[PDB]
Design a protein around this ligand. Structure first.
Ligand SMILES: CC(=O)N[C@H]1[C@H]([C@H](O)[C@H](O)CO)O[C@@](OC[C@H]2O[C@@H](O)[C@H](O)[C@@H](O)[C@H]2O)(C(=O)O)C[C@@H]1O
Ligand SMILES: CC(=O)N[C@H]1[C@H]([C@H](O)[C@H](O)CO)O[C@@](OC[C@H]2O[C@@H](O)[C@H](O)[C@@H](O)[C@H]2O)(C(=O)O)C[C@@H]1O
Ligand SMILES: CC(=O)N[C@H]1[C@H]([C@H](O)[C@H](O)CO)O[C@@](OC[C@H]2O[C@@H](O)[C@H](O)[C@@H](O)[C@H]2O)(C(=O)O)C[C@@H]1O
Ligand SMILES: *[C@@H]1O[C@H](CO)[C@@H](O)[C@H](O)[C@H]1NC(C)=O
Ligand SMILES: *[C@@H]1O[C@H](CO)[C@@H](O)[C@H](O)[C@H]1NC(C)=O
Ligand SMILES: *[C@@H]1O[C@H](CO)[C@@H](O)[C@H](O)[C@H]1NC(C)=O
Lengths: 321, 164, 164, 164, 321, 321
């Protein structure tokens, strides 16, 4: 005799989802919404290559550590990769003022154009080719940071320096300079004659007067002396004025900020891999349509939303048995 | 099952129905076969699809972490910074996981609900003219050819037709 | 409809019932009319009202933003500060929107549930003495004047009264 | 009650049933007594137990506050710090309270659902051989000794046995 | 034949709500819980008027920029309104130490009472009426910040200043002073005689010794010189001690903090409108019973909770068709 | 006639839970998940006792305030308890450089081993037993911070000090020293002869040159003079170098960091109670299996999750009447 039945779909799917009241529930259909895969490489971001600092830090790069000549001229970049502990940094021991605030600026910059604002040849009444150290060796020989010049006395004389530079460019200028902190009064006179010295710096915004600090210090890279570097952004049509009667590490090359944008300083030990992606993490790139991922929080490009989960699956079908 | 249909009074599912999630199996003189109720199956698709897209769009403006650095004498702000990103990271991980757990439960009960409503749709049409077996099947008190079956499937069953 | 009543076996709503959300329409010798079941209508009001007040009171201690300023060499903390307030702003926007979406769904199914429970309340009283038409109506096997109707409305129907 | 069983068509609970949440009361020649349906009672236990453990495990990585100090000229970061911990504290207090409110409602309706499904399990076995009184009781049209009762309790009721 | 039906309410309402599974669902009753309306004005807050800095900054106000005389005496206020970029600030170019920390204090202050702690007339052995500049013009004439006095030499002599002020008031004192950074040694002597100068300041809590920084700087408002201002809160019964032999910009007027409370520095280009509210945003006031609003996060007074949503409606009735 | 009924459990329980739609719902079974009880005592944490600074601050402890001799030698600790306002701090008025950053380090340290790096007896050409003040009294007599030594002139002579200390230990060294800021030039010569003085300090990482600030200041603890303290972590195998011709407050005792770990500086007025716990709050200890608690946010040990709620109960059973 005739009859009719109402029923539901079932299949050979062992896909599981979790609920509040029961875990590992087998369903007929399920959508995974979590990406758990990367390619293990550092790639370009939409065609534009990252600046991969290899064994160098931002400081070595910007100040021009001789061990960092690979980065003397740097094309436009998408993001920056720096290691946990770059071995090439301050070859001459010392410090970098507002280092972290500077690295933060680099996150909104994509391109630097290196230009010579004060040529090394332009120093007439001072020695500009003897400012070297075995702490910054290049190919065995004592050398120094390439973008700044360590001036000393000439013919037992260090005349007071009065130098100006006007920013006639339309872009902001990253300008770098420094002071040398000797280790005794004999070294001070032997290098700069004048026992009492200063460095004054002025823009429309900056007004600082530096004095060297004599101090006995432990040797770092063979030197007890110290180099302390400072920086400023020079606005277009503004000028920077230097005055000094010793211990001045003058700028030679500065940086035109020609491209602002969305960047990042990524921490990774990985090196460049000839590849391309739209989403990059410190441990590899993501190519996914997924809304979520659990690879790394620090991300750049068009990426899924990072979550600490190791599993995220949405039920779409119904129970199965 | 919250609505008692799936794995309830209806013991198992049909491997044989591939055209939809819910449907019918009929048995008459002309033959036997499975058929999917497109209306309730589509309504289920349109529901679950919206649910997935809504879960996704509610978490599209989440919290991305950026990189900041701090020197050896800024440990307080460094720590503040770290706990803060770990903070947002934790609440958004809680959100995603919880939402998935909660809506997954709803989805299964949604399907369970659809099955019982479909059952009651057929049950409320037949009334006297058939009897509930108790497993999702009705045994007819008359003959129901394909035309009669389709009338049941599209909610146009002509009850005026006897019994005994 | 999760409970299959509203827009389910009961096709549409009544424009004519204005005294409540759920109720009855009767048809006897004395006349016809609509009447609201105050008990289930009040219970619905007391429910939804509490729900609104609970949604409100759970978000009364949210996260208000204050104003802080930072100079040109405090960009890190300025950025930290900004992401943090945007952070809390995002999770609280997620909370409000999600809660509304979730409880709205509950509210509609709540009303759907109330309608079926009301139907079953009348259905379980009548039993033999009337027959289910299938659209929310019962056709009586006896005469039910206003007194009999009110007995049904207040759950005091005296079943001892025949059929056929 | 969302499923209309508890405090619905079944007016009250049984003080006399102590072996489980849901069960049966029988009345035949051999005597009377209460009995708990272990299957649906265990399934309820396994559900609510998981629910509690899941609520707990989702909030095990919350946000612990640490102590930081700031001098008289770091009021901005001090304030930022304070609002931030008060911030996370507020969203996690919202989470716990809301989750409890939402799942508590589910739990009660879960129990309500279980009761009706149990009722329908017995109802769908008896069919003709008994009549629904309307309070969760069926009045038999035959004699049901302890063996017959247990058959109903374990879903092996042999319907082939007459009426009138 | 008699019959009875069970049914539900329906009406002519097209109010819509959204769910997780379906959007734009028409219901019979709905409650909107989101306020999306403001009056576009800056109002009083419960009767007490805001201090509206017009084209002046906090600095111009507190130091007494001649362009800011509107705010020489200021009644109690509810909140402060400052523009994105006030044109009247440091008329003489320079800087303000801990400017942001000071503006943060202003958020917990409602009233300032300006008082004269050191009268301009009290300077006998110095010139106190020549400390003016074409960088701070008043009505064409060269002038200066009104609350501080730029002292110079008198009869080719700048005797070392030893000045004390005891805070015999019961309220904290906001005290402001400054140093002048000249642009060369000729200007230093021409103004203060003494080539080597200092400013020492002491309270029970403060211990600072300032020295002027000679530097060549670009002209700002026509001046290459710089003014650097400092501040301190003087506790009741504590005293502030100044010593200086040049370059001292002494306080004349200080601020009694007579009203602490809940304030704010609001950023807005809007000006005062003769109105009153219990909730104020930078772009207008809110008069609402709503629990939520989406106007602006930065809020003051008794306000709804800010949310990024553009729509928030709660279903109260049921489906409709 | 025979019949069978389906029903549900009910009991004599008045336990209540709340829902979104209804509050105070009576259930048959409920689980409370919120701990609201503490013992009102400061206990050990898993056997290891906390360091309870009583009326002393971290500064008084570390610098060796004579009022703080209880903490001259301190065993390993679990957490630190400090009052809201310790009365014993800088007995001689002055300041502590990077005080908060130092207290933050203490949160990752569990044990200090006090050692004598420069013995007071080792000063031959200076007075090392006259550096006392009535601002730091011990038992009535004028005394001073015990871990640092206030040196002065000897036979009207203060020869320039050149002192080194190498860290031959395997643990980091917390090293503390200070400078004295006199109140006039007569006091400067009377104490140190030399009118112009400095203190230079160098490690492989530190390079600072301190100069004293003459200033007239209000008396604090009877003194207008000021002591300003500085600190550094000395890495193993690194050395610290001091040079000075006056105003030097040299270290005598430093701190070996022998135990790093999970600690905390807890704020509380409570004192030690002879008890033990696995979870400690500023107002008492918790012994609970509960997942939540509402006692205090600032917590240490294995604790429940803090929540602002005053009630959290989960329904497990069903409705009851
Ligand atoms: C520009 C210059 O003078 N470079 C010197 C450098 C500087 O003198 C020094 O770094 C300044 O701080 O010194 C270097 O080593 C010098 C070294 O010579 C030893 O013989 C001497 O006994 C030591 O005291 C020390 O000065 C260096 O390479 O960095 C030499 C360099 O030419
Ligand atoms: C108190 C006082 O001396 N005010 C002077 C002011 C100061 O000399 C100067 O600002 C200090 O930094 O200089 C002002 O302009 C002076 C201007 O005069 C030119 O002729 C000269 O060639 C320039 O070098 C320059 O000094 C000023 O108005 O601010 C004049 C003011 O009277
Ligand atoms: C090492 C030493 O000289 N201790 C002195 C101390 C110092 O002179 C002073 O603290 C340096 O800042 O002074 C103390 O009081 C000195 C007190 O004596 C009065 O008679 C005099 O009129 C005051 O000017 C004042 O110097 C002190 O106890 O701290 C004395 C201490 O011996
Ligand atoms: C830089 O030079 C241009 C003219 O070449 C001038 O307009 C500008 O003022 C100069 N900048 C400064 C700060 O001197
Ligand atoms: C201020 O003067 C009062 C007496 O008029 C005195 O008590 C108080 O010590 C003085 N303050 C200072 C720091 O000298
Ligand atoms: C400390 O002494 C050891 C040898 O005893 C030496 O190796 C180390 O370089 C010294 N440290 C410094 C910084 O001089």
């Amino acid at each position: 005799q005739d009859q009719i039945c109402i029923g539901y779909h079932a299949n050979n799917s062992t896909e599981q989802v979790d609920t509040i009241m029961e875990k590992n529930v087998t369903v007929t259909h399920a959508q995974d919404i979590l990406e758990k895969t990367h390619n293990g490489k550092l790639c370009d971001l939409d065609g534009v290559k990252p600046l991969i600092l290899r064994d160098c830090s931002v400081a070595g790069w910007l100040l021009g550590n001789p061990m960092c000549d690979e980065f003397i001229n740097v094309p436009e970049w998408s993001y920056i990769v720096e290691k946990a502990n770059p071995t090439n940094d301050l070859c001459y021991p010392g410090s970098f003022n507002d280092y972290e605030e500077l690295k933060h600026l680099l996150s909104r910059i994509n391109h630097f154009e290196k230009i010579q604002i004060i040529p090394k040849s332009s120093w007439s009444d001072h020695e500009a080719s003897s400012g070297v150290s075995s702490a910054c060796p290049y190919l065995g020989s004592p050398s120094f940071f390439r973008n700044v010049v360590w001036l000393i006395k000439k013919n037992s004389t260090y005349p007071t320096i009065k130098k100006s530079y006007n920013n006639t460019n339309q872009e902001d200028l990253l300008v770098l300079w420094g002071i040398h902190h000797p280790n005794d009064a004999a070294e001070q006179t032997r290098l700069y004659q004048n026992p009492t010295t200063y460095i004054s710096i002025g823009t429309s915004t900056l007004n600082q007067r530096l004095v060297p600090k004599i101090a006995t210090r432990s040797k770092v890279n063979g030197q007890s002396g110290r180099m302390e570097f400072f920086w400023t952004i020079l606005k277009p049509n503004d000028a920077i004025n230097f005055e000094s009667n010793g211990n001045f590490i003058a700028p030679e090359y500065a940086y035109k900020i020609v491209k602002k944008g969305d960047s990042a300083i990524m921490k990774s030990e990985l090196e460049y891999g000839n590849c391309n992606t739209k989403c990059q993490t410190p441990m590899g790139a993501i190519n996914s349509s997924m809304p979520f991922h659990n690879i790394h929080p620090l991300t750049i490009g068009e990426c899924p939303k990072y979550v600490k989960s190791n599993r995220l699956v949405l039920a779409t079908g119904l129970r199965n048995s | 099952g919250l609505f008692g249909a799936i794995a309830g009074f209806i013991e198992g599912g049909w491997q044989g129905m591939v055209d939809g999630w819910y449907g019918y199996h009929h048995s008459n003189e002309q033959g036997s076969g499975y058929a999917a109720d497109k209306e309730s199956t589509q309504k289920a698709i349109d529901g679950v699809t919206n649910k997935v897209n809504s879960i996704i769009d509610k978490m599209n403006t989440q919290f991305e972490a950026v990189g900041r650095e701090f020197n050896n004498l800024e440990r307080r702000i460094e720590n503040l910074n770290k706990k803060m990103e770990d903070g947002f990271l934790d609440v958004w991980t809680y959100n995603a996981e919880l939402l998935v757990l909660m809506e997954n439960e709803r989805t299964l009960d949604f399907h369970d609900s659809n099955v019982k409503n479909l059952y009651d749709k057929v049950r409320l049409q037949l009334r006297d003219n058939a009897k509930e077996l108790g497993n999702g099947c009705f045994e007819f008190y008359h003959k129901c050819d394909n035309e009669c079956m389709e009338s049941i499937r599209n909610g146009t069953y002509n009850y005026p037709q006897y019994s005994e």
